[PDB]
Symmetry: D3
Subunit: 318 residues, 6 copies
């Protein structure tokens, strides 16, 4: 397609004020405290996979709300410990958990776990639907930070790191986090909420700068928010929903990241608008780099794959 | 748009064999038993509304899974006891609960309750998401009849009738059920599972003839099923999901309806294809009429509104 | 969809200079004089409608050009006189005259007439096509104010008020005017050209700020003007057509309205762009209120239905 | 795009039974009588045009309903008397009357008149709108053959031939008729109702086999009929409208054509479906040829232009 | 459609700095030197065409790279010499060479040759594909000015003028160049590279202001450039490709035109954006006129046909 | 989307008669002879890549027409000699040559070469454009089998196998071929024309059953053929083009494949319609399997990736 958001020169300095409420930190502390009360009880079940040099398994663990979260976990068939990667997927975009991708990461030398998102693929979402929402997960439980869909998801993302670091074959000092869109948002959230990750690569991250996203995105799934306001029109509901979203907005969590970050953005992306991604990036206060691709949108960028592999190889395989 | 399904002469005789499993009746008996364990505990909260001649309220009750189900309840501002209507809404299509429509029904002389569907608007869905599903509600809990999303919805629909008939101002012998698409499916399911309704009017009913629907629909939401099979490709998964859907398929429940039914179908409907609606209609063994509109699709049909009003007036008011 | 016109902060003060030619007032005076020469000769024909508490009829009267204009007229089956409402419909958007809507208004307590637009539904358009026009009615007779399509329509709209006020069962001191899009334009035009209405509720009004509308609308039917210029390209034709449109532009007629006005606008409406509606609103010099809905476009807005009912109930049922 | 109607072998034998009512001939005789009552009073007004070898004029004449019909008339700037062509245009598709094309026809050696269709461009439509119609001209006056829009158009088309043949510079024995879509329908109707034309070339003719057209067309304007039935749903209305269309259906007029006919059809045409064109062609009982183009739709076909020029050259110039 | 580029007031003064590299003139001199080494060896083959007053032929000649370029050549069947026109066609938009158009130009009095573009229709493109390109011709050989697709095309365009001027029946002092889009770019390029043309009429010219075109066009075929950058992502490749395009950019060649130019632009054209055309126009330093059509896009503009014919008639038939 | 081609039972037995001309075998023998005249002169240039366990290179060789063909070649960083794979890419669908994918294949244990298609990416197409063609490569040189675009491509594909098997580090007895769409067509053509491959995996193969493809495909690129017939309408041209395509149609080459073949087809594929793929499959007379995926179209199918890896592992590694 074509350009549509602020010009690159303006994007470079686009940095909205944080929207985090006064109890933002307290909310995350309490949420992590809740997660800590649930014993992970990890279980590894081998899987038959048509490749040599790797051992593949279905990893399952317990998280917030006693939810059963799973994903494929692939490890180099070598004597570890190994560097590791926790890979997070896109919104409604996992097709059988991307087992092939996980195996390729293991072949590249990383014990890799592709966490599958609760309610979207294979993992259980034990959180209820307290008040009715628009089609999708974006507005599920949006009237209260405690019941919001991403509360459980972010906690699951942190638990994934606690579980993989606990493995004897994983060098917990060399774990990376990565993912695209929704996976990119989870990558930033995980690095902001856990001291475990050592490096983060986020493709056009999702769940950033909600106030702007709903007025500039031209495609789904930010627009589910707009849809919820069409179906629940009281002015008070809109105020409450934006407030709960502010607790999950990665531009609010970004200044907690302490490790190196590599991020990408395609200038014609109408799903995660460039402005929203620059907002998250400009809120990071850590070693960081934003690779801008003028001719790409919300999709796989071959040149950035090269950058991602070189970054993880430099930091995690040092 | 234009014609696309079987020609009318073929639709008239289209009657697929039932797909109900051997334990279909047991499943519904057990499900109704699970519903009866939950005390309804109805709560009526008056609402200020800008109209004379009617009293409006927010009606809330407890249903399957201890879920809090709600909706607007409007009653003629005259001494009862009054004929009544339970109105069911379309998939993801309630905008603040259609309060205006409920009021109009009351002005027409019917104590009317617009049940809001659990998880879609206002009403709570306490059922979890056991295994991950495609975007939407169609595949939530589809790997087991006990966990499937419509199990709770159908029971809620029956409970709505139990609650309204219990009111002293409602003539329990003169209650009708009505709704469009998903609302039409709920209308048929309620009349199939409850002896309360005395008449049913279903617009192009949804949740019918799933095996055909997924192969002929050209718009959502039927296609969420297809989407789930794309993301969960195991052959066994497909077989299991179709088996669970067969317990909720209104063509399998249709032979249980024993009161008069009025149904509509637009021949250019690509959401609820004509074949799927004729399948439900052809399984009904009761006083019935199917109004076919050649030039209408999945939308409001003015001529059918007249038929609907005439039908309820004739049966519920005489 | 999404935002596209001027930002709300700019819309608030958007007020183009009037485009009314020097003989604007003379044109309307002469036009009303022509209408006055035609005897209304109203005729009421009862209709069988499936509802109690209301009497429904087909009302037919004679207007400008000896045209036979009709519509459904519904009255509370009570001893009047009653407050009344003249409801105007959208462009090419009446489906059998919206009889059900008219009946609901009567059930709300108002003797209501839904005027059907000449040439579009049931009413006769005796005005010829003097010079050929683009597909539709927007350019029919556009080369001369005397032959322009809306000359007859606006006069018919005023006659509708003269006819309903003449009824013994109608309290002519309590008549409201209402309608959406084209119906909203007719509502403002009627209130600007007749001293009869006591209150006006106009949804996103059509036929406003033509100069801007043709450069900003992204959907039909303002674009019929552009289509006419593609087919009749002389520079002189464009000048003449914009001049005739200026006599019908509701932003030019707005300062004649003397009664309270309630108006709505959805910020994503690409049919009646927000700027065009703010233009009409900012030209009103009367008790007024503009309800802005960020997430709605050119469609039914549930929250505004509440506002409309409360407004008419407060003014007309005082 | 791609194929979509009956396969070629089936198109070749597709010949629906005529739908002409018992008084079809009487209707046309009476209509021609109404036309003859109006004196043509042709007026030729020279026009300055940037080309040598041709004299251009605006030709205006009086027709049915005292309507002023006009169009460009271009003649070879040489002593006549000259073969001539009456060219008819597509539905809502004349842009300033195609003056350039008329000039080219004259440069090819034919005194050519491009009749502009009443109400669509330049020419006046004095027939009223008796009962309201869907957007467009297709349903204007459709409840009665006497008031239907094409009654005036067909008579205007015959009158065009009477006027051009009356000119001393035109060889009345060498006049052809031609046009595309609506122009093709007019071409056939004119040759059916007038003995003036000596040859006819019709591109994918419109206004044919209405019963099939409304069920198979996928684009306008056929679909205006469907639109009218959506807005005027009485069963009797549909029956009456189809009856009036049957008087203007070129498949019913085709057996009256007694001069050579050349016709074209693109197999991917979704506006004038191939079946509808083959229906007209198969009802012709005269020297005829149907050129079928597999890869073309409703558009200019270069190869057919050669066929058309060759045909008129052979017949009108020898 | 609707407006989308800079407002007309801004377009009027839009004039980017030239992007021509330091060896721009040397490149064209050397390129013309290469063309001069190839003997034209023109061949005329008569064609059977169904019209009197014109002789039609297939003209074929040799050009750069020993390529065989052809097109239809039509001449008035009169004693010359004649004024002449070289007509260039749109990108991938010649349907059998537009023989009918060529014949009409001859009937207007001009010996006319419609050059068909190498590789696109009938003419041979002997230049290879040196490095792989995106679908289409826009990026073929783009990594080097010497191998770029338009090098051969522009040279062929100049050769066309050398060949037609060489004919005894052609008055070489009265030759015009004309064409639309890609044909408009070739018209400007030819007039910039050859002293032969005496007048030029270019419709919305293509191949102008590439830097802006790729960021503002919303349709094809400028976007092939963007597509090539998606498939060949090294930063160096983008720099090299923009540099080679700068040698062919008509805004860089425009100041070489010494004869009168007539140009058109439709304000809603999303193929050749108005800004890009104003850029070329504002770089012309010769007798010039730009006709702006607010309601037209990338298509035939009837009013401009009149202007084109009057311009060529005034200059070429003086 | 949804189903659209023949139903599965009919696809299973769909086997059109071969369309190969009498000199089909001679053409391929002569073409292979032309290829053998060109010395391959392979050149391996190491490339720095961010991964351990593999050596990456740019492999370049000379093929038919002295064309320089290239692609990425990745080898396990272990002592060989290694099983190998030649991977062919989709039409206009290589983004920088899929270096990442080639590396992954090597990490899976296969010396892998991703041949880049001449003229589409990186590789040179030295064949000229003899007669002009529609946008794209499908019709380039289609008027003669000797000049047709795929002649060079198929020979390049065979040459790729000759080059990789010649490497000392490659076990020439364990080489597979694979690719999707156009890549699948190349996979079958290579296995048909070379005895080198020991196994073939083709995703929905393109370049099959051209007579049906042009009449049933609903997306490109098949439709470029149709586009060429629109621009070159001579009946003889169509006959000649279909004749040249018959020499490259994989259904005509299929009976020459004598090694195991694994193929896939998505039933909603509108680019390579299921019928066209079943045609190729049904002409194979070798160990074969066709995996049918009801809910997938022309895209990556996760389950098939597992099948593909399992197949090559079983055959090439044992």
């Amino acid at each position: 397609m074509q350009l549509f958001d602020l010009p690159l020169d303006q994007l470079q300095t686009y940095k909205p004020e944080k929207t985090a409420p006064k109890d933002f930190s307290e909310f995350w502390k309490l949420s992590l405290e809740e997660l800590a009360k649930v014993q992970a009880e990890p279980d590894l079940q081998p899987v038959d996979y048509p490749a040599d040099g790797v051992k593949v398994y279905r990893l399952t663990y317990k998280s917030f709300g006693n939810a059963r979260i799973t994903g494929w976990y692939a490890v180099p068939d070598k004597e570890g410990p190994h560097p590791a990667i926790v890979k997070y997927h896109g919104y409604n975009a996992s097709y059988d958990g991307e087992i092939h991708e996980m195996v390729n990461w293991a072949l590249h030398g990383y014990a890799t776990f592709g966490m599958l998102v609760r309610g979207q693929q294979r993992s259980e979402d034990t959180s209820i639907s307290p008040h009715g929402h628009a089609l999708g997960w974006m507005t599920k439980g949006i009237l209260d930070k405690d019941t919001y869909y991403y509360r459980g998801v972010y906690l699951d993302a942190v638990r994934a790191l606690e579980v993989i670091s606990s493995f004897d074959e994983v060098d917990e000092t060399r774990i990376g986090v990565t993912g695209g869109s929704q996976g990119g948002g989870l990558t930033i959230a995980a690095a902001a909420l856990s001291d475990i990750p050592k490096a983060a690569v986020a493709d056009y991250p999702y769940l950033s700068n909600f106030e702007r996203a709903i007025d500039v995105a031209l495609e789904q799934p930010y627009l589910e928010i707009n849809s919820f306001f069409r179906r629940n029109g009281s002015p008070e509901t809109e105020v409450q929903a934006m407030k709960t979203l502010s607790y999950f907005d990665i531009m609010n969590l970004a200044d907690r990241v302490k490790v190196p970050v590599l991020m990408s953005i395609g200038l014609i992306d109408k799903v995660t608008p460039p402005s929203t991604v620059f907002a998250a990036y400009n809120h990071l206060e850590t070693k960081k780099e934003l690779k801008v691709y003028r001719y790409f949108g919300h999709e796989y960028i071959p040149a950035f794959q090269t950058e991602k592999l070189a970054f993880f190889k430099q930091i995690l395989k040092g």
